[PDB]
Enzyme design. Structure first.
Site, short mmCIF file in Angstrom:
data_model
loop_
_atom_site.label_atom_id
_atom_site.label_comp_id
_atom_site.label_asym_id
_atom_site.label_seq_id
_atom_site.Cartn_x
_atom_site.Cartn_y
_atom_site.Cartn_z
N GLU A 1 -5.94 31.87 60.05
CA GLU A 1 -5.87 31.63 61.50
C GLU A 1 -4.55 30.94 61.78
OE1 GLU A 1 -9.48 30.11 63.54
OE2 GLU A 1 -8.15 28.63 64.35
N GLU B 1 -12.77 25.70 59.37
CA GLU B 1 -11.96 24.48 59.50
C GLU B 1 -12.77 23.23 59.30
OE1 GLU B 1 -9.61 24.53 63.14
OE2 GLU B 1 -8.17 25.93 62.25
#
Length: 300
Positions: free
Chosen positions: A225, A136
Site C-alpha cells: 500500500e 497495518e
C-alpha cells in the site's frame, strides 16, 4: 498472460521471482475498503485496469473493523469475486485482512485463522493468490517480537496446511513501516514478504534507507500500500516525492499496490466523482493521483 507466463511466485535470496527463477515486479491498484467502495471491484473494472493501465496485481482491501468483516462478514464474498476476476484475467491478487483501528492483529486472530483457512482451501491451488495477513499493525504496544511475529506464526500454519508456498505478506509495526525490526527477526517460512507502506506527503529519505537496511538482511519487501497523498490519505498530492519512490522501487525490484481505487473526495483516490464503477475512464474521470499512477504502470 501474466500468470500463465510467470506462474508460481516464490522468494529467492530476498527477491520475488517467477517459476523460472527470474525477478518479477508486480504493480497494481488496491481497492479502498470493500464495505464502502466495493462497487469498483468487479471483473469489468479489473479488466479495464489490466488492459488500459497495465496492472498485473489487484489488492482486495477487506477491512476487519470500521464496518468491515467482523461487523458484516458478507464482504468476504466481494473478496471471492475479486479473486475469481483475477483468475479469469490472468493477473495476481492480494487478499488483504485489512486491520487498522483494530491495531493489534491479535484482536481478531481467531477470525483471521478461520478466514484464511477458507480462502486457502478455496484458492490454494491457483498461483494467482497472495495472502496479506495484517495490513497495518500500529501503536507503541504492538511490536514485531511480542505481537506481530507470534500472530503470523499462528496464521501462516493455517494457510500452509492448504497452500504450501504461495506468497504471504506480513505487516510490520508502526503502520507497516518498521521493516528494520522484522528484518532482524525474520519468520521461518521461505515464501514470506514483509509489508512496507509509504505516503508521498512524508519526506522519505530515511524510510528509503530503512527499506535498504531490511533488504540487506535478506528480507523480501512488498510495498502493498502506498499513496501520493499525506498519511491521512488526503491533504494534497505530492508527485515529486512519489516519483522518487517510484524510481527507488524500480531500482530495488519492489512490487507495489497504490491506494486506492475509489471516487472518494480525498487526494489519494484515483478516480473522480463521475467515474463509472465498471471502468472505461476518460482522462477527466481520473484524479491527479490516478492519472499519475496510470502513467507509472503504463510506462512499466
Amino acid at each position: 498472460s501474466v500468470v500463465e507466463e510467470h506462474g508460481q511466485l516464490s522468494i529467492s535470496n530476498g527477491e520475488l521471482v517467477n517459476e523460472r527463477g527470474e525477478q518479477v515486479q508486480l504493480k497494481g491498484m488496491s481497492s479502498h475498503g470493500l464495505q464502502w467502495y466495493g462497487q469498483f471491484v468487479n471483473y469489468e473494472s479489473m479488466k479495464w485496469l489490466r488492459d488500459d493501465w497495465g496492472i498485473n496485481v489487484f489488492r482486495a482491501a477487506m477491512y476487519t473493523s470500521s464496518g468491515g468483516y467482523i461487523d458484516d462478514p458478507s464482504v468476504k464474498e466481494k473478496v471471492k469475486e475479486a479473486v475469481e476476476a483475477a483468475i479469469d484475467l490472468d493477473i495476481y491478487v492480494i487478499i488483504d485482512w485489512h486491520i487498522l483501528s483494530d491495531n493489534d492483529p491479535n484482536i481478531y486472530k481467531e477470525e483471521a485463522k478461520d478466514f484464511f483457512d477458507e480462502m486457502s482451501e478455496l484458492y490454494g491451488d491457483y498461483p494467482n493468490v497472495i495472502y496479506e495477513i495484517a495490513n497495518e499493525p500500529n501503536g507503541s504496544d504492538v511490536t514485531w517480537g511480542n505481537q506481530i511475529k507470534p500472530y503470523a506464526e499462528e496464521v501462516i500454519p493455517i494457510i500452509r496446511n492448504n497452500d504450501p508456498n504461495n506468497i504471504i505478506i506480513v505487516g510490520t509495526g508502526t503502520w507497516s513501516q518498521d521493516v528494520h525490526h522484522a528484518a532482524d527477526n525474520q519468520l521461518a517460512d521461505p515464501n514470506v514478504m514483509y509489508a512496507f507502506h509509504f505516503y508521498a506527503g512524508t519526506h522519505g529519505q530515511n524510510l528509503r534507507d530503512q527499506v535498504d537496511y531490511a533488504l540487506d538482511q535478506g528480507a523480501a519487501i512488498f510495498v502493498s500500500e502506498w499513496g501520493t497523498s499525506a498519511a491521512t490519505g488526503d491533504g494534497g498530492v505530492f508527485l515529486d516525492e512519489a516519483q522518487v519512490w517510484i524510481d527507488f522501487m524500480d531500482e530495488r525490484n519492489l512490487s507495489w499496490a497504490n491506494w486506492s481505487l475509489t471516487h472518494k473526495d480525498e487526494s489519494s483516490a484515483a478516480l473522480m466523482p463521475g467515474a463509472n464503477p465498471t471502468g472505461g475512464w476518460t482522462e477527466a474521470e481520473l484524479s491527479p493521483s490516478g492519472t499519475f499512477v496510470r502513467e507509472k504502470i503504463r510506462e512499466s
